[PDB]
């Protein structure tokens, strides 16, 4: 049929238009502040290097050392709590990359672990999302017909709710501002996970605050379920339509 | 029906067993080398600090400067080529996070850009994956019936092929070893994207090698399509089954 091919080319051309707009806007927003801050740091580098009479080779070596110690500033991060947090970020595909396997054996196992883990996790969050959509239909009917205008509204406000209570929690535990914590929540639950903000890294929380570690694992696995129950409603309505 | 609830609880219990096994294996693999390397770097820190008679406060300030210059070692990364690469890593949800929005305005726009972009990209890769699955069915029939034992085999070897030719390309352009380039390919195309290995960062490639930038964008968007056409075959067979 022609319809599927027209829809495919409409989606490809739309996606490349969306990328060219995104690239233009991010460049217009960020490429000047980047140059300003780079000039400022290139100045402060020479200021401190002169202030401590540091040889260029010595600065190069100190840079290499600091850039290798950058992750170990988190304290120990490979331990059972932190290995569970890593496994979460692998199979959910968040992948912050603050912890990443250092040995070749850890890399090979990480590859097989993701290989079997990601399908299984997609099938879990699909099944559980469809269960909670059915529950929402049932309870909304008991409160009365039900229509997409109600289901999508309840899904949308359930997402906005889980973002707000995530930002409220993390801006209290991590002392980020509310906007920073809300950004971290959004970037985690879409599974983008840049890793510029990462929870559990301060104050040895991975071995010191089991209640907060538990909260963060439950929040990640719950918010991903609510987002999955929203994509299950709003996107799988359209994606499988080629099979029609 | 009971079946959907039994399947949901079987998937939840399976996922938590899979996490507890993953956490145990990663801890057993990595938590000793971490402590060894941390001891080695804590030694080398004091060695160089003494070798350059560096005050502890001066070391703290040099550490702060180096840790802020760490990304700007990539040269300019917010420019049109690098903003297109960023937009790719946002809407595909790879999110390496080597570039991440520095201003609050770039963060707000990044949030709305992901919000509209990720559904659209899932629907694109679904539609295009189902088209190439239909093409594989058609051509395999022309080469003759067709069965899942053939379709899944061809999908699997198409994935292994795109990983091998990705590793072969990147281990040549980036001078990573083959295993490192294969790891980077696998971690990109599953969209985990830790960001410990990232392409295009060396030698100002973003403004110096348009042919290699083009290759990398085409490889990312093609390999994601082939992986999408594989999940479309092997997982959407099972995920929607709750709707049965
Ligand atoms: C998560 C919330 C906040 C946003 C959700 C957005 C998506 C549900 C939208 C964004 C872009 C939309 C797509 C944009 C373009 C098209 C092509 C359109 O097909 C045609 O125009 C051709 C039809 C034919 O030839 O038969 C079908 C709907 C579809 C897939 C849309 C389906 C719904 C999408 C994925
Ligand atoms: C969503 C429903 C159906 C289940 C919810 C289960 C959670 C309440 C469980 C699942 C995994 C558990 C975690 C698994 C491992 C750990 C590590 C454990 O030890 C440490 O954090 C100290 C460091 C170390 O032990 O090496 C503390 C409890 C904690 C966070 C657990 C807290 C409770 C969690 C989050
Ligand atoms: C990408 C390649 C290399 C690996 C693909 C793996 C998946 C296709 C597998 C991994 C785990 C599997 C799931 C493991 C357990 C179950 C529960 C099973 O349901 C029951 O056991 C209960 C049935 C009922 O109560 O009716 C249905 C299949 C399912 C979803 C499986 C579907 C197929 C999955 C997702
Ligand atoms: C998959 C099929 C259907 C379409 C394939 C399209 C590609 C061949 C296009 C899409 C976007 C293009 C890129 C968009 C932007 C740029 C930046 C441009 O400029 C630079 O890299 C220099 C830096 C600067 O311009 O600021 C060089 C070409 C390049 C990599 C383009 C190369 C060709 C690309 C990858
Ligand atoms: K990611
Ligand atoms: K990352
Ligand atoms: K992802």
Residue numbers in the entry:
A (entry chain A), B (entry chain B): 1 to 144, 153 to 252
Please give the exact wording used by the authors of the publication that reports this structure.
We therefore determined a cryoEM structure using human TASK-1 protein identical to that used previously for crystallisation (Met1-Glu259). We were able to resolve this structure to 3.1 Å resolution and the overall structure was found to be consistent with previous biochemical and crystallographic structures of TASK-1. The channel forms a domain-swapped homodimer with four transmembrane helices (M1-M4) in each subunit, a pseudotetrameric selectivity filter similar to other K2Ps, and an extracellular Cap domain that lacks the intermolecular disulphide bridge between chains found in most other K2Ps30. Even though the distal C-terminus beyond A251 is not resolved as well as in the crystal structure, the architecture of the X-gate (243VLRFMT248) is clearly visible and conserved, thus confirming the structural integrity of this gating motif. Cholesterol hemisuccinate was also identified bound to the same external clefts as seen in the TASK-1 crystal structure, i.e., next to the X-gate between the M1, M4 and M2 helices with a second site in a higher cavity along the M4 helices. Interestingly, despite the high degree of structural alignment in most other regions of the structure, the conformation of this pH-sensor in the new cryoEM structure, determined at pH 7.5, is markedly different to that previously found at pH 8.5. At pH 7.5, H98 adopts an alternative rotamer conformation and there is a disruption of the hydrogen bonds between Q77 and Q209. There is no direct comparison available for an equivalent cryoEM structure of TASK-1 at higher pH, however, some density is still also observed for the downward rotamer. This is consistent with the pKa for TASK-1 pH sensitivity and indicates that at pH 7.5 both conformations may exist.
TASK-1 and TASK-3 are pH-sensitive Two-Pore Domain (K2P/KCNK) K+ channels. Two-Pore Domain K+ (K2P) channels are a structurally distinct subset of K+ channels where each gene encodes a subunit with two pore-forming domains that co-assemble as a dimer to create a single pseudotetrameric K+-selective pore which spans the cell membrane. Here, we resolve structures for both human TASK-1 and TASK-3 by cryoEM, as well as for a recurrent TASK-3 variant (G236R) associated with KCNK9 Imprinting Syndrome (formerly referred to as Birk-Barel Syndrome). Overall, our results provide further insight into the structure of both TASK-1 and TASK-3 channels and demonstrate that the X-gating mechanism is a highly conserved structural gating motif within the TASK channel family that, like many other K+ channels, also exhibits a degree of allosteric coupling between the lower gate and the filter gate.
